[PDB]
Amino acid sequence: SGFRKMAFPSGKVEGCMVQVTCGTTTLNGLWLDDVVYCPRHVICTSEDMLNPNYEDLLIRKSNHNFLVQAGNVQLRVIGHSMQNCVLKLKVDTANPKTPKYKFVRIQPGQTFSVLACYNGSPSGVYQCAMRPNFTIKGSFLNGSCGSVGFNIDYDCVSFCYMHHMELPTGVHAGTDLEGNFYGPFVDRQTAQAAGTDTTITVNVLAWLYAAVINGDRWFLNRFTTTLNDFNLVAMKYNYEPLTQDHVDILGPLSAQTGIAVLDMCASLKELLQNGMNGRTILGSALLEDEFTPFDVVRQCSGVTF
Amino acid sequence: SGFRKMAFPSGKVEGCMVQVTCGTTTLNGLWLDDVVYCPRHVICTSEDMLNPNYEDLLIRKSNHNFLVQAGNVQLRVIGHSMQNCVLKLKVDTANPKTPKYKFVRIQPGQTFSVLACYNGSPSGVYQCAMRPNFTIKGSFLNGSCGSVGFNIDYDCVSFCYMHHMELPTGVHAGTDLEGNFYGPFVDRQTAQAAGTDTTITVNVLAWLYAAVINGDRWFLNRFTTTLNDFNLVAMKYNYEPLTQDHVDILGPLSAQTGIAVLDMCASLKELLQNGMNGRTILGSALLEDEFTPFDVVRQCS
Numbered sequence: 001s002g003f004r005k006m007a008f009p010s011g012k013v014e015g016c017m018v019q020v021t022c023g024t025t026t027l028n029g030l031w032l033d034d035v036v037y038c039p040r041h042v043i044c045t046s047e048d049m050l051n052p053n054y055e056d057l058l059i060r061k062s063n064h065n066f067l068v069q070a071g072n073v074q075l076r077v078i079g080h081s082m083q084n085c086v087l088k089l090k091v092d093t094a095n096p097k098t099p100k101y102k103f104v105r106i107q108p109g110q111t112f113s114v115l116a117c118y119n120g121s122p123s124g125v126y127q128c129a130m131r132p133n134f135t136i137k138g139s140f141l142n143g144s145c146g147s148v149g150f151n152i153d154y155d156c157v158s159f160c161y162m163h164h165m166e167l168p169t170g171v172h173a174g175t176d177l178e179g180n181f182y183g184p185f186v187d188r189q190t191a192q193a194a195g196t197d198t199t200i201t202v203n204v205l206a207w208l209y210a211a212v213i214n215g216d217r218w219f220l221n222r223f224t225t226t227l228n229d230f231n232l233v234a235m236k237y238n239y240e241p242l243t244q245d246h247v248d249i250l251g252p253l254s255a256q257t258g259i260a261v262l263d264m265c266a267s268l269k270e271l272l273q274n275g276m277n278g279r280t281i282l283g284s285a286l287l288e289d290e291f292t293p294f295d296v297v298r299q300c301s302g303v304t305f
Numbered sequence: 306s307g308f309r310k311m312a313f314p315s316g317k318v319e320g321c322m323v324q325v326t327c328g329t330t331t332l333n334g335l336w337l338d339d340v341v342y343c344p345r346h347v348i349c350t351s352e353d354m355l356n357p358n359y360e361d362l363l364i365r366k367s368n369h370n371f372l373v374q375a376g377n378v379q380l381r382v383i384g385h386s387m388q389n390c391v392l393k394l395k396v397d398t399a400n401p402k403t404p405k406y407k408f409v410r411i412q413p414g415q416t417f418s419v420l421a422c423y424n425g426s427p428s429g430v431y432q433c434a435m436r437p438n439f440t441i442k443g444s445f446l447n448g449s450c451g452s453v454g455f456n457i458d459y460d461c462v463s464f465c466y467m468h469h470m471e472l473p474t475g476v477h478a479g480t481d482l483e484g485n486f487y488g489p490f491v492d493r494q495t496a497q498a499a500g501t502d503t504t505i506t507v508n509v510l511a512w513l514y515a516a517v518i519n520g521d522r523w524f525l526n527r528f529t530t531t532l533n534d535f536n537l538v539a540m541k542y543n544y545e546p547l548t549q550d551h552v553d554i555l556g557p558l559s560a561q562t563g564i565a566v567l568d569m570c571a572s573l574k575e576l577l578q579n580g581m582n583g584r585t586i587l588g589s590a591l592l593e594d595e596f597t598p599f600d601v602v603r604q605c606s
């Protein structure tokens with residue numbers, strides 16, 4: 001029993017965290033094989049952040065301008081290239097702690113673990129979801145840039161995020177490991193605002209299935225709904241539309257609990273219109289949307305890494 | 306900015322997780338140096354669970370009855386001893402991945418990370434707190450026994466918990482790494498019930514200070530209170546009494562935010578009386594009590 005917000009074990013990623021220093025800026029880098037990946041804004045100071053020509057700033061840099069530190073060992077930079085918003089520092093040493101890894105771009109609603117680092121040193125791990133507005137509600141302080149988001153698939157680490165910045169509302173923006181931003185964000189100093197967020201519907205439904213698996217049934221009802229009627233109601237409460245893909249994905253949880261997805265939709269529909277009424281689901285007074293259907297299965301079955 | 310429930314990086318503890326098998330039972334062990342620590346109930350049979358004599362069952366066991374597996378390598382048991390509710394299996398290999406560590410016994414209200422394992426294999430990490438009733442609200446399935454609770458402070462792993470059992474309410478009971486149970490629990494199938502839980506008041510106040518640091522001030526008020534008047538109100542909502550130690554502990558957060566501890570106590574009384582009114586504090590509609598004053602300072606500086 002129990003349902004906690006659980007991150008993947010961070011050991012395989014901790015062995016990849018390095019400190020990258022370029023001039024006055026110190027952020028984190030991800031050392032995989034003989035390459036160190038980090039946000040390209042490390043080559044930026046104060047005027048280099050306002051209106052920056054990154055190709056122009058990078059051509060002016062030499063390999064010895066980047067001080068890379070793996071623990072107490074300085075890594076020798078032998079090359080530098082830029083792919084989108086990520087800087088790639090070729091080093092002389094291949095990381096012996098390099099795990100089996102992939103660079104994957106995730107979709108909104110998908111969750112991943114974040115290993116928050118400061119000065120190439122891991123300080124915490126947490127689980128969060130790529131919001132529909134492409135931001136992450138992270139916990140980051142100055143110096144966290146270059147902290148990575150990942151999923152662990154069997155023995156393979158799928159890197160899906162690199163932290164670049166904090167928006168004025170306290171939410172975070174970053175890129176996949178190929179330097180492509182998540183959302184309409186750019187890596188510079190300009191007016192950028194996160195779009196109005198929406199709730200990840202498939203994730204709330206998965207979390208309601210997890211509540212049923214844990215003995216919380218108070219919200220269940222005898223009613224069912226059509227997918228169209230549910231989406232008409234969901235749109236009104238700023239909830240993401242539920243597709244037939246989502247209904248299919250929730251199939252195993254529906255089979256395990258004996259509650260059809262559209263029957264669970266009718267419970268969510270009542271919860272949106274009438275509220276919790278002083279009651280809680282899995283210790284929460286709000287509908288949780290940062291557990292995917294796979295996360296629920298993984299935690300309520302016992303999958304290991 | 307931001308406030309998340311944050312666990313410590315689990316790498317240093319992952320390198321210590323082994324699988325311990327004794328007869329039909331398979332749970333997790335913690336391999337530190339040449340010793341593997343695990344719950345002593347790994348030696349228990351079917352009829353030897355309601356009233357087990359552990360000294361008697363252990364004297365009947367030999368080193369080859371324990372199959373210890375570190376990844377795909379079978380470790381060789383060369384000794385066995387029992388310290389309270391933990392079994393210590395002396396092995397012939399010192400764990401090369403052994404970090405700088407300590408065994409620390411924590412007090413209720415203290416937080417720690419849990420690395421949940423199944424068959425000596427880490428499946429996930431989460432944060433939780435020692436409840437005032439000495440249980441943890443964990444997420445554990447059968448086979449998670451021997452999973453450990455830890456804190457990491459300046460390169461050193463402080464082991465503070467080892468999972469032993471699930472109570473009938475779904476909450477969990479376990480021991481410190483010296484085998485001493487937290488709470489009035491025993492490692493027997495006897496009728497055991499967790500005492501009625503209470504909210505960790507000092508932790509809620511620390512979390513309200515974290516909300517102020519993050520710009521959330523809606524709950525603040527013009528009032529202050531006496532510690533006695535606060536405790537009289539707190540006990541009515543099943544909140545732990547706030548001691549002068551707690552008031553002292555919240556001093557740095559009080560200095561940083563400019564809100565006196567007893568002034569924040571008056572905010573908390575009002576929150577208890579009125580509720581949230583559709584508003585949230587740090588993305589929560591409930592008062593969070595699983596962040597210590599030390600966690601708040603750590604995360605906000």
Ligand SMILES: COCC(=O)N[C@@](C)(C(=O)Nc1cncc2ccccc12)c1ccc(Cl)c(Cl)c1
Pocket residue numbers: 001346354445446447448449450469470471477491492493494495
């Ligand atoms: C055959 O195992 C039955 C069982 O419950 N065994 C465990 C081992 C048990 O509770 N363990 C489990 C741990 N954490 C979550 C658990 C969720 C579900 C089930 C089991 C959990 C048990 C039981 C009674 C005692 Cl006194 C002790 Cl010390 C241990």
